[PDB]
């Protein structure tokens, strides 16, 4: 069968951003111990991810603003008050100790997962600690400092035919979106909330440049968006993109941010209906790369990855938990599986065929015969 | 609780133990054989043969006991 | 919106590239792998449990360690479970294995050090910087993790 | 009552094999040794250690008599 | 009263004689001995009696045979105890043993001369020489053996 | 400690001589089953008697009178009726089978015990199947047929420097007194019924010939006798005799037929009285040799025996185990008894005769 690996270190958990601010990375040492305490630990291997150099981060951020990490303290704040506003460092991303060697182990993550699907003797792995997309060349944004996916992405490159990327965060994936913006082998989809809403871009004429028109895909979408809803969208394209883009390995950006019970986000989803998509993925039997990234609800999020975790091996785990440390943080229910919110569908039928009718004619464009 | 801990180290070596245990009866299995069948033979073929060896065989455990009362 | 001087920077990619010398000797370091040729046998699954739980009872801690420090040991042996109780039942795990530094990994106290957080915590509430100041021998980040593990001690 | 042969068969065995039961423990005593310390290390010192070690090495004797049963 | 002639026979005693070359290799075998160094320590000497009882239970009889069939064999390892139970699991004890010949010394049937018993002593009560000419393959010793041993079955 | 030699076959149990007749050889079997089952195994080396050979038997007997043994059969019994009345041989010793080889068990016993006590390496040997001493050269009596207690003598004369012999059966011992009537290295005491009994012999002038006077001694008795009546007379003799005689082996004839119970005795003894002697001797610390002989109650002679083995050992023993003869043990089931309701018939005056008379006889040898 398909064999698996895991990435994970435990110095994340102790680091801290700042007074009220949503993002916590602890909420990745809980999911650590439920793949232990489930035993799934049996069927899948771990790595240990080293500190991630300044060499890579050079490859694509300037050397200049890297040096600038370094001479940062919380302490010193004040001396660089107009170099600080300039690169947007501030209220959403706020300045504490440790913050660069934060960013060392989730570069280091996805970059050494590219790796062993660069070995080209296994087909899926696993890093739910990066996930950053919406960074910049110069600047940080929306709580994300370093683009690390396109840096794990460049070492697949060179060795795969065609890397297709999704993005299923209720953020928008646009700084992923600008570094494949003309070219054909790299196809961006990207669905998200659309309409007053960070970073405020994902309309429907985001189609590309060049001979980039058709390769880069948006299917923006408002709220309350519900799991079945979902199956009416997501299936019927990526069987027409198969045999149409032939892609040759996956980047699955599980954006758990999503689900219902968000600080955030107003969908309508569960577990069940964002682990029901990996399973039409799986059933392609491809080279995947899943990873994380958004998430402010961390009693829901660990509910998530766990289960998609064991869905790669195709696996059953039973519904519910054993002894542990955090068992008491899991809901009054300390189950598994959970229930949405009561909203409804607020998209139209018509809405759904509106991209549907006028899109996949567009795809047909393409050369194939 | 205190015993509890040793008995989660007792189904541990269980098995190593086990082992061993089944290696030194086999010396002293051949005795047992001959033993059941000629009771057999002499009281009638209604007794059980392989039940009465395995009765001597918990009843030798039983007194090992003595070594750690 | 669309920068173009911040797009890219000469990806170079190829998409065969057969045997470059892959990399990462050093970014993973594997540390478990499966056994399922004795193990996975529904016969010795339920062995491994029985240890399992076994460490997370009256046995020594090292920082407060229930089972995580005996998991990573087991890989050392590969396909036994009495040899790591040799070194288990060893003065330290944590001191002989310098090379490997996991024993420092998995986790990352004084009474007097336990008294300045009432007085320190308890009257600013919000300062995250006297904290590690008046407590010198921690850091923020091992000041941060009782927060997390104090929070059954109410109920 | 033919068991009764049986039971004098044992009192000729028992104190050879318990022999060799002594021979085995000693092999694991190294294992409950320092561990019953370190248990009354983070209990107090009311337990008695020995005691312990007794009730456990009679525990494990009577999980083997299953493969005799 | 006094005959001289039947005194004595020309004795010819000394009285020292020492070292006369002293007879008896053959007169007198051998077929027990003590043992007291690790036997007689009030210790190990019910180990023989459990033993002892243990032969007349349900094992084989030869002639029917409860416990001296055992005693002799003992004194052929002058030490052990599992050894005999060896050579009294084999088959017979009294064919492969011929030379010490003991086998057939300690204790010295069939219907058909059983039911001549009944029909030969209870007619005539006193022959003693009809009882073993009727019953041809016993003798007269081993007619008599049979007396004292239905003696309880009556009772 | 000292070491003990005990000697056994099991073919004797099964001869029998004839209906009605007291003596049967079974009562053997039946004491070395007790010596077993008391555990008293650990402390006694056992010895397989082999079969006496004519020769030894010719240095005594007449190799003619044995010859006529081989040729007799109970079916041939009439053909040499001379002969039989000639030798005794009739209602008193009569023929059946294997009559021969019953006598060379007995012979080869004793003939036996004799040689591990030339050995010189041990002190007390035991052999219950002998002790028959009524024989004489050409002709059987008194039950017996062979005088092997003269014949186990001849291997212990010599080597030993004084052999004492001693004959507590209610017989008397007059062949043994035969056989060294003349000679003074050997000792013949013997107390027995006198009066109307079997030999008819033993009385007080029975005393010796040439140099022989006060070197065969008896001190016959009457019914009645008391295990306390028999100390009085026991003791004080020996304790005279041992610097007088000065012994270096003992040869005590142990004829239980004078306990209670008995089909021909009518004496009152019991376990402890007879087996009270021993302990005195045993006190001196010399060669010893124990034999048999009469006895005709099977079940009291077994538990005489038994303890008097036991005894040699200085070893005390306590009742009986499980055994196969255990109900041939009375209804009590215990080993020691209780004797009958007869009194001593022996009076005080009568004790003094020979002990006033002869303690003194005695000082008429060689001592200073
Ligand atoms: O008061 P509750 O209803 O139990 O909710 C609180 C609260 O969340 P909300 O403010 O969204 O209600 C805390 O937020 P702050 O009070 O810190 O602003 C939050 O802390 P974080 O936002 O820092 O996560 C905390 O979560 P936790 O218990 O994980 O610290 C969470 O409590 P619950 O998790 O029990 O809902
Ligand atoms: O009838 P019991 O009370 O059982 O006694 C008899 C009886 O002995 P008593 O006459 O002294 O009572 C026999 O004597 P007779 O009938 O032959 O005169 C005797 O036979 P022996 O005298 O020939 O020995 C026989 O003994 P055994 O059974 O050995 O033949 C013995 O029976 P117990 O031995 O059972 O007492
Ligand atoms: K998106
Ligand atoms: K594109
Ligand atoms: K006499
Ligand atoms: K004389
Ligand atoms: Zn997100
Ligand atoms: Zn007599």
Known sequence: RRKVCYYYDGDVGNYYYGQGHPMKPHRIRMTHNLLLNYGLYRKMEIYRPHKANAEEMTKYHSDDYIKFLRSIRPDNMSEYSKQMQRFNVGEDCPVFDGLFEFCQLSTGGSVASAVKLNKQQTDIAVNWAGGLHHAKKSEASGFCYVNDIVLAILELLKYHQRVLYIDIDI???????????????????????????????????????????Y?????????????????????????????????????????????????????????????????????????????????????????????????????????????????????????????????TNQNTNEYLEKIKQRLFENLRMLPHA | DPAISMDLLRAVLQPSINEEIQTVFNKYMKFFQKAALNVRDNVGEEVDAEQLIQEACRSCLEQAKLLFS | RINVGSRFQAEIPLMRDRALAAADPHKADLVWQPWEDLESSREKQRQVEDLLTAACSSIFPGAGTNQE?????????????????????????????????????????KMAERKLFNKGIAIYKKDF?????????????????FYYTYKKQVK
């Open chain 1, 171 to 213: 953020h928008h994936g646009d700084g992923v979106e600008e570094a494949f913006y003309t070219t054909d082998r790299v196809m961006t989809v990207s669905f998200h909330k659309y309409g007053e809403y960070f970073p405020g871009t994902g309309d429907l004429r985001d189609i590309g440049a060049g001979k980039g028109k």
């Open chain 1, 215 to 343: 390769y880069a895909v948006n299917y923006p979408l408002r709220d309350g968006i519900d799991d079945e809803s979902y199956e009416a969208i997501f299936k019927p394209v990526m069987s027409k993109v198969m045999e149409m883009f032939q892609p040759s390995a996956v980047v699955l950006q599980c954006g758990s941010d999503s689900l219902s019970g968000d600080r955030l986000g107003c969908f309508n989803l569960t577990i069940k209906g964002h682990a029901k998509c990996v399973e039409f993925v799986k059933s392609f039997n491809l080279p995947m790369l899943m990873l994380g990234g958004g998430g402010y609800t961390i009693r829901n999020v660990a509910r998530c990855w766990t289960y998609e975790t064991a869905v790669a091996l195709d696996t059953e785990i039973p519904n519910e938990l054993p002894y542990n440390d955090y068992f008491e943080y899991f809901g009054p229910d300390f189950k598994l599986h959970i229930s949405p919110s009561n909203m």
């Open chain 3, 69 to 109: 420090l005996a998991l990573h040991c087991l890989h050392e042996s590969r396909g036994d479970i009495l040899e790591t109780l040799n070194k288990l039942l060893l003065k330290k795990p944590l001191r002989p294995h310098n090379h490997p530094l996991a024993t420092y990994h998995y986790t990352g106290w």
């Open chain 3, 129 to 145: 910087f006297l904290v590690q100041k008046l407590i010198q021998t921690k850091t923020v980040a091992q000041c941060v993790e």
